[PDB]
Each structure stands twice: as C-alpha cells, then as structure tokens.
Symmetry: D5
C-alpha cells in the first residue's frame, strides 16, 4: 500500500546519512543508479529525499550503501518535497538556477504563451537531464534540458 | 559610453507599455525579434527589462512598437535585473520553474559536481531557448535548454 | 496573436475600475457572465485579473460595464496570475480557504497519494464552483467543488 | 476534562512515528479509519496532528498502530493546528491547493458575498472529502468538496 | 445587488480622504455615527475600510463629511479587510493589542478549550467595545471587551 | 533574588511537560489555579511560559502536577515572553484574536485616541479574563475582558 | 477635537516636504523648536511624523517653514507611528541603535528585572536626548540618554 | 591566541546553563560581576553570549557558577553576536527598546547629524549602564545611558 | 547648516533623473567626478543617493548634468542610506557581492579577529575603489579594494 | 570520486567542533593552514564549511585538530555553501560587509558596467585577502581585496 511523508526532515536526515556512506565507499551517483533501470537524475533525487524508489530499487541501493531496514522502507515513501532550506538557495551552484528564473522567468512565461497558449509547462509530467558538452571557445558547458508537458488552461 | 539603471521599475514600466503597444499591433515576440540578428529569448528578455539591446536592435524594435526616443535609449541601458516581484513567483506558468528547483535543486547540484566538479554552471555565459514539439504519447511538450559554461572553483 | 502580461498591477487596476463600474450599475457577476457561454467562476476570475477572456466574451462584458477599447483588449491578455496581496490573505473570507489548507493540507496530500498515487491534483485542468445548500440544522452552507485532473509522477 | 496542546511539534513528532508504524504494517488510511465511525479525512487529519480523536477512536487506531499509552493520550488532545511548515507549502501536491487560492481567492470572495452576503464560509463547521472519478477524456479526476457553514457579518 | 472589493487600497485611500475632512470639520467618531443607528466601533471600522455601511448610513456620513457620490457608493461595498500595513503593527497603540496576543494567546486557547471545548471564539459573530473607567489608584483604564460566539469543531 | 530567562524554549519545553502531566491526571486549569490566590488566566499563562509564579504558588501547582525542583524553580523565573511560534498564529483558535486586530486595530487606535487621548492602552498594567456566557440566541459566548491602564503621551 | 491618522505615508510625505523647505531655508532643528516651549527631540519627531504638535506649535513651525493650511493641520494629528521603512533600518546611523539592541537587548532585560522587577521600562512615559561630550582621548562622544518609567508586571 | 565563534547557538546554550546555575545558587548579576574589575553590563552581556571575558574574569565567574573547563574556555571566545531570536523581539521588556527606535529613529538620525555631522554614533566604542531612580511624580524610572564615540564619514 | 533625509525615495528618484540626464549626454561617472576633488566611487555613490556632496562639488556635477536648484540642494543632504531594494539583491552584478558574504563572511570575521582583535572593520572611516586589470589567462579582472579602519571592542 | 553535501548543518556542526578543538589547542588559522600549500582564507573557509579541502590538506589539518576519520572525510566534501544564518548577519563584524553593500552596491554595479561592460564580477573565479596596514593617523586599517574575473553578458 502506498505510504507518504509529511515532514521533510525525516528524509533529509536520511539523505545526509546516505551521502556520508556514499563518501566512505567512494561511490558515484552514476554507479548507485547503474543496474536499477532508473535514470541517474531520478535515483539521485530519491536519495536526496525528492522522489520515491520502488521497492526493488530501494533494496538495490540499500545494499550498495549498507542501509538498514527502516532506511530502505523510508526511501519507498512518497516524500514531502522541497529541497531548498528557506526558499532562496544560499549555495552558488543551486543559486544560479534561481538567478536564471530572475532573469528569464517572465520571458519563459511570454514565450510559453506564444508557442503553446494559456497554461503551463508541467513540472510533474517532466524530466530533466544534464549533459556535458565541450565548448568551442575552450572548457566545458552544461546543457540542462527541461522537458515538460504543456497543460492548457481553457475557459469553462 | 555604456549607461546603467539602478531602479528596476523604470524598465518594468517600459515593458508594460511595450506590451500594450504589441497587443494593439497584434505582434508576436518572434516577429519583433525578426531581422534583429538576435535570439527571440534574448530580445524578448530585453523588452521585459532583463537585458540590454544593441543600438541597432533597439532602433529596429522601437520602430515596430512606435516607441518614443527616451524608450529606445532606455532599451540600450544595462538593466537592474530581477523579474520576480517578490522572490517566489505567484504566476502558475512561472511557478513551475521554481518548483523544478524545489524538487531537483539538490540533484542539479549533486550531478554538476559529479559531471564537472566543484563550481557552478554559469547564468551569464549562458543561452536559453524554448522549443515546442509533439509528445510521442499525445499532445505537446516544451524543451527548454539551459546552456551554461562550467566555471570551476579550485583552491587558491 | 496571443498576448500576455508580466505585471499583475495593470489587470488589478482594471479590476478595481470594473468593480466601481459594476457597483454604479448595480450588477451581479451572474448577470455579467450571462450570455458569454462561460461559467460565472471563470468570467468573474477574468474580470478580477486571473483569467483571459476570448474576444467575444470580452466585448460582451465590456459592453455591459462600459469599458473602453484598451480595457477590452487587456481583458483578453493572459494574466500574471496571483490575487493575494502578500502571500497570506488578510481578508477573513479569503483567509478561511487558507486555513482549510493549514488544517487539511497534509491530509489532502496523504489521501491523494492513497486514492490516486504519487503526483498531484492539478490546478490547471481544473474547474471550481460554489453552490449554496440549505443547512438542515438552520442557515446556509457553501459547497465548493474543486474538480482537478490527477497527474501522476512516475519513475523514468 | 478536555486537554489541549500549545506547541505543534509534539503532535507532529507523533505523526512521524505513526507514519513509520503505518508503513511497517503496510496499512492504508482507509483501513485505519474503519470501525471508528469517523470520516477518513477526519481520522487522517487527527493522525497528522490537526484534529482530536475521541477516546474510543484513539484506542482503536492506537491498537492498529501499536502506539504506547502516552501516544494514545496525545491523540485525544486538542492540537495546536497548522500543518504547513512555513506558510507556503513546498510540496507540489500541497502547493496546488495554495495555487487555487492565488488564482481563485478573490473570485471565491466575490461569489460568496454575491450568493450569501457579507461574512465568511466557515472552516470550523466544515467538512471535506476527496473522491476519485473517471475522466471522460482518459485518466482520473479528484473531486474535492469543501462544505462550510455560512456565517454572516451584520452591523451592530 | 451586493458589491465587494478585492484590493484594500481603494478603501484605505478613501479612509485617508475621510480623515482629512473629519479633521477640517473638527468632527468626532461619536458625532459621525450619531443618527445612524449603528455602534461607534462599527461605523468607525467602516470609515476606515473594515466594514460596509448600509445605504442610509453611507448617505448620512457622506453628507456629514461632504463626500462625493463615488465615495458614498464605495462605503457600501463589502471590503477587502485587513488594516495592518505589514502583519505586525508599528504604532504603539495598535502594537499593545498584538502584544496581548504574544503574552496571552496560548492562554486564551487553553481556557477557550477548557470552558467551551474544541473550536474557536468567532471574529464574525462578534463585537467589541471600549469603555473608560476611573482607576482607583489614579488615572483611567480602558476596558476592551471582546465578545464572540463559540463555534464548536466536531468529529465527522 | 529575581531570576530571568533569555531563550523562550526552556519554559516552552517545560510547558509541554506540564501539559502531558496535566492530561495524565485529567486536571483542569481552573483546578490547578485553585488555592493559589491568583487568577486562572495568570496561573495558566505562567504554566505556558508567559508569566512568573511566586514561590508559594510555584510549589502548589508543582505539587498537583508532580513537578521536580528544577521545574518549580523555572516557573519562578521571569520569562522571555512571546507565545506565538512565528508572528502570525497558525491555529484557528489563536488566529481569530489576530483577525480581530486585522479588522479592528485601526478602529481601536482611533477610539482610544478619541476617548482617552494620545498614548496607549497598556498591556503590562493589565488584566485579562475569559467568561463563558449564555448566548440568548442559543449556544455560548466568550466575553474576554482586556483591562488596561491608559498611559498618555504628552508633549515635553 | 483630537484627530488621528491610520496611514503613515501621509505624514511621512509631509516630512519630506518639510525637510526640503528646511534645507532651502538653511534652518536647524534647534531653531525650528526654539520658541515653541517644546524639546527639540519632541518637535523634530513631530516634523518627522512620530508626534503630534499642539495647534500653537504647529502654527509657529508652519510659519517658519512656509507650510500651507492642510500641512499645519496634519501636524496636529495623532500619527500612525513607525519611522523604520521595513523593520530593520538600512541607514548606518539608525542601524547602530538597532545593533545596540542585538548586542545588549538581553542584558537590558536581565538588568531591568534585577534592578526593578518583572515588567518593562516604558517608551510612552519616556524622554530621550542627545548630548555631545568631548572625548578625553580626542574626538566627540554622543551620550544618548533613555529615560523611561518602570511599569511593574504583578500577579492578579 | 584569540579564538572566535561562528554559530551563536553554542554560546546561547551556554547562557541557558549559566542562568539555571545562577537561579539554583540564587545569585545576582551584580555579585557575579563583583571582583572582575568589569562593569555589570559588560559581564552580563558576556554571560549572555554577546561579549568575551578575559581569562581571569572567565575563571572567576566560572568558579562562582561552578562551570566546567569547556564552558570557561567558551566564555573567552569572541562571540557571534546577535541576541534577538528573529529580528524583532517578542518579549515586551526588550520590545520597548525596539519601539524607541520605531518612534525616535529618524529623530536620532536627524539630531546626530545636526549636533555631530555626517557619520554614526558607534555601537563598538561604546558603553552602557542602567540606573534605577525615583520618579518625582511617584514610582521609579530607568536612566539608560548609551555612550558612544562619534565616527565621521568624510569624502575621499 | 547641515541637512538630512529620512526617506530614501527622494534621493533614489533624483538618482533616476540623474541617470536619464547622464545617458542623454553620454557621460561617464569618471567624467562627472572629474574636477570635484573626490574619488569616482564617492561621487558616484552620491549621485546614487548614498553619500552627500560638498556644495562646490554639487554645483559642478549639477552643471555637467543640467540639474535644477532643488536637485543640487538635495545632493548636499545627508542621505537615508540603503541602496538594496529588499535586503538581498536580485541583480546578478550586485548579487555576486552578497554571495561573497555568504561564502566568506564567517572567514572574514575569523581573520579580522585573528589579525586585529575583537571589534569591527569600519564601513564609515572607509574608502573603496574598483580597478580593472588584465587577467593573465585572458580577459579582465576587477580588483576592488575595501579600505577600513579597525575599531576594537574592549571590556569596560 | 567527488562527494557533495546538501544540508549545510552537517559541515557547520563540524565547524563548531573544529573551533572548540582549535581553542583547546590554542591554535591560529595562520598555523592550521601552514604546510597545506593553500591560502589562509581558503583553508579557513573550508574549516568553516564554505570550501572543500583536497585529501592531503584534510589529513594535515585533521591531524593538527585531532579530528576523527569521518570529519576528515567531511572536510573533503563539496559544501552546501551559505554561512549567514538568516540572510542578514546579526554579528557587527560580519554586518559591516553587508552595510558596505547597502552603501556601495549600486556604485559597484555602475562602475563595473562602466569599466568592463554588461555582466558581472565573479565570486567563483575569485579570491580575497585581508591585510593589516597601520593607519598613518594612528591605529590599524584592514585592507580587504576582492579580486574577481569579469564575465561578460553578450547578446545571442
Ligand atoms: Br504541473
Ligand atoms: Br555566473
Ligand atoms: Br498543475
Ligand atoms: Br470560521
Ligand atoms: Br470566525
Ligand atoms: Br505598556
Ligand atoms: Br510602554
Ligand atoms: Br560602529
Ligand atoms: Br563602523
Ligand atoms: Br560567478
């Protein structure tokens, strides 16, 4: 039977334990997700308290990280989602994504309405991924693709 | 000589005026940006107070919208950036992008550090585009590409 | 061509003007919506800056309220939605709905996940109505129906 | 003698404990509330710290969940209500109901005053229920019914 | 037909105009409410944007303060209530009432549950009054009386 | 020697302990305050962390509640007052008193100034009581008496 | 008849006007207060929107600053007090006084309770003043004296 | 070697331990400071986490209060200063000081500039004392002396 | 006689007028500060409302910018300082300086206490300059110098 | 394999532990950093939770401070950066740097755009140092140098 959380702290405390075990074992997120059938972004978000793992995946990652039974069960719960401590991120790496919204938020809205119409680009029927692409001018670029379904707003 | 702003309301007031003109003329953002040499996301962001237009572009769009001269000069000024009224958007269309950050923010962090290293994906050496495509399962999707240069943090 | 707003104050200012006009004419929202072929709750939300009217409806209600042309055009723009002045309502009528969330929010989460699964009940593919029902103990009840589509969150 | 709480964390810490027990026994909210004589939404809300159970219901659910006597006692206390961590929910599921308020709050006020008069629709003399309904176009809809007593505001 | 406001600033601006006239005419709130049939506290709350006056009171106070027709009409609208500028009062006189809540809020909760049971003391079915008394140790006391109906919360 | 507190959580934690003990003994606040020579609202506020008890009363309530010596000592300390978690109450019961201030705060200011003059109605030279009263219409009312000394602001 | 304000902005705007006129006339606060019979701190506070002037003083200072009739009347109104824009001052000169509270607020509480008892040092029956005193180690010192009446909190 | 703190909670927790020991020993702040060669406000502020004690003073108050070595060492650390829990005090005793800034903040700014010049009255080169004295009209007053060095801002 | 402001918007509105004038004349800040005898950062800060100009400098920059007499007078007033709209900048260019504080603020505190002692590095007895240098890896760097006097905190 | 944190409190608790060990051993940050090959500001920042140490450095500092293996591992993790407890520092030493931004932030923006162009001075490609320089008028000056790379914003 499906089970859900209401206090994000239970899963976020579990995330810190996971990250410690991960480091002690010198593991990567790619390796933790490999063999699971699930995308690296999905498995990683689950570890970090933002998604639920199916049971088989919870056991698979529990074994890799030496987690206890309560922990494997907790990973299967539907989380109380929200990873930002206090609305605005303090961390530079996360903050950049917030700043992209401060710069282009209204442009995303205007261009969505133009291309699709009234409504939203969904954050539920959605996936994201991060690809590394060499920069012609030197160094590396990240192309983050946000991929979401258009949900129209219509009169009733 | 480059000229900059310190109070966002001046450019945001101009954005409202530009939108009224645009609606009166029943123009699209794609049409406004056409012939400009610049990406629709870039030019649109300028209209909306978040970027500076080169004089040539400003003149072009200023013609299209019948702007007065103070308006065409204002569009060339470097803006006081920040399109969100009070930190967290209230508009559902803009909110979904904020929600991506609440669900995937710590995952983006974790995976940027894994794929690139310590540091950030930049929001200045950065490009944005929005594509409408059909969803294989039915209806329409947005593919939004956040294209940013990796900037490492290294000891000193 | 579709047109959108980015500053809520343009449509909220129009809303106050509409409200004065309406009062002077001693009209109801029921009567304003009459003949539009659109629900009272939809047309009302439009006048109040939270939905866009199609041109024909905009011209009908403009007629009823003696709106000028710029106003009628504005009513057709996709709004920058968000009707609450500063996140938490101060008005008792509005506040009671916020208190429903403070009391039942986690219960709505839990029971949604139990009945439907992981994901959300949407606010976009969504309809709302308000019905007055006699209370059998004496007085009147409001039955407010929130009718939203289930959007699953599945692994990928 | 009736007993009441003043710090929400006691009962929210209990709710976390309850949820772990529930997960361990693979129970549903529907099963927990069976035999109680009380609505699923009311019993769930009590488990989650937002309502008080009568003593018989408290003993029933305590038995189902293997709760100690202090926990069974606590469930009977009148709580310090407020389930949202920090005013605006982070969780998408909970957030959609907040967004309904940001889009429709003022329409709700408008239409309540039109249909009933000055005053409020109550959140205390109040019932709430969640029903799953097939969507004609495919998939599932939630019909959430808010049912509140009208309390008029009159001159004195 | 009943008319309602959604933006408090329309009535609060009217309030300021009312106060200026009141000052210019050297009137008291006592005098302004004379002849209306309505308590001082209720009429005052109206002038200040927190209650609606019946048509006949609106005309009476309007004539006293030399208000235009639009202002007299506005006073009859059901307000968007909330007098405090930004949640916590800065003014010492108002602040004392908020401090009473900071000292006695939990005590009021506890004693309300003890005496009446689960639920609330209402702010709708409610009145207040301010009375002056001599202090037997010198000077004067205000006895502010809050009189609200008990509304029970019961299981369903 | 008088002793005082600087972190409210010490006394608030004590209050939760008191409330568990009270509930276990099925005690009322009225019965706890009996024999102290002090008003119900005063003793209750002390238990809840918002007043100091004299030694004798501290010993007496501690006897009835089975409190340890450190706890009886804590009840005699002058508290760091402020019972509200985060400025605005979440709990419906407490919230209604905040809403009274949102609806009537400026009226209270206005009528205080008219009846008494410039200055404040004190919250320190102050007493509070809660009286349950038959409602002639059926049901019950709370008459909450706020009895405060007027403190004038005079030029200097 | 006493008259009071409810929106600080009316008197704060007037304060800006007064400061412009003062500057054009190259006047000091010392000379504006001279002749009124009122302390410089009181008269200054009044000009700045935080006290009311009696009629004769309002007329005197109005003559000195060439204020119009409505401005002279506004100065006699009991203000909606609160001079800080948004709770925490930005201005360094004002901020130092807030920092004194952040460093010594709890020490002030502790020592007031030790020296006087439970209760407060009042801010109504209160005067303050700023004296320049040569610093024996070179430079100048401000001695700011805060002088307030002790109001005891006693059991009832 | 000088040592310093970055998280206020270490020293604030230590403050609560100190206050319990002080209450248990029935000590005053006056007598704890006796023999340190240091002012009662300075030593008190140290105990409360807002200043650093020299080693000799730390040992002396340490022996009076029976503190362990880690505690005595912590007292010598340069603190992460800021005694207010969440910017605005809730405690009435501390609040009055904040209210003095809300009423007289801009007056203090204006008079400091007039009497001293452009700059600040510092909170670092600064001393504070609290005196109890009779009020000529009856009762008791506090004379709180804020004694700080004027620091000019000069052009560069 | 020295003159001061209490509402930042008077000088910020003047700043926006200055910047429109400066842009029409295609002036640089370096040119405007030329011949004033004052550092470009000092004069610029003054134009932007954060410092006061001496009378001769005010006249000079006012000649260059074609400012009227009231505007020239306003530049000589001691400002209500505070350039950040709402505590945390939204503009990326300004935000980066805030991020330096989020990353290095506690390091700064630690290294100041180690190198100088307990106290502060002043922001009043202070100068600032921005220098453009070549980046030896290619591109350009800013060397921004914060030059402030150490002010110790010593026991008393 | 790189390892990253998501909750700042893990590393901040570590910092408090480090600080106590450091105090006990009477060590300086200068000397902790010695032997490390990394700048005092960088190493100090790492100890305080704002930078990651390479493995050799982590072992070296870990041996000086008597840290356990888990702590030495945690120091190697990429941090969730943000040292300020709640956006605006309370500590006077840290606050001065915030105040510098309140006084000079718009000047920094203005001059950066003038000298370099549209874009930012970076806080990732960035170093800082603190130098003591005797004030020739007496005492000591801290010269804090901020050195960041210019990142242009260009059209695309
Ligand atoms: Br969605
Ligand atoms: Br960047
Ligand atoms: Br949705
Ligand atoms: Br209600
Ligand atoms: Br109510
Ligand atoms: Br008081
Ligand atoms: Br007071
Ligand atoms: Br200072
Ligand atoms: Br300073
Ligand atoms: Br950067």
């Amino acid at each position: 039977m499906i089970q859900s959380q209401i206090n994000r702290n239970i899963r976020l405390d579990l995330a810190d334990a996971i990250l410690l075990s991960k480091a002690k074992k010198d593991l990567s997120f790619a390796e933790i997700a490999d063999g699971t059938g699930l995308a690296e972004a999905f498995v990683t978000a689950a570890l970090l308290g933002q998604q639920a793992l199916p049971a088989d995946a919870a056991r698979l990652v529990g074994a890799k990280l030496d987690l206890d039974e309560d922990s494997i069960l907790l990973l299967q719960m539907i989380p109380l989602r929200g990873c930002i401590d206090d609305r605005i991120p303090t961390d530079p790496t996360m903050y950049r994504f917030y700043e992209m919204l401060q710069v282009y938020g209204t442009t995303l809205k205007a261009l969505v309405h133009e291309k699709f119409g009234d409504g939203i680009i969904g954050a539920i029927n959605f996936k994201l991924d991060v690809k590394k692409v060499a920069d012609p001018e030197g160094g590396e670029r990240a192309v983050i693709t946000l991929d979401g379904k258009y949900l129209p707003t219509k009169p009733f």
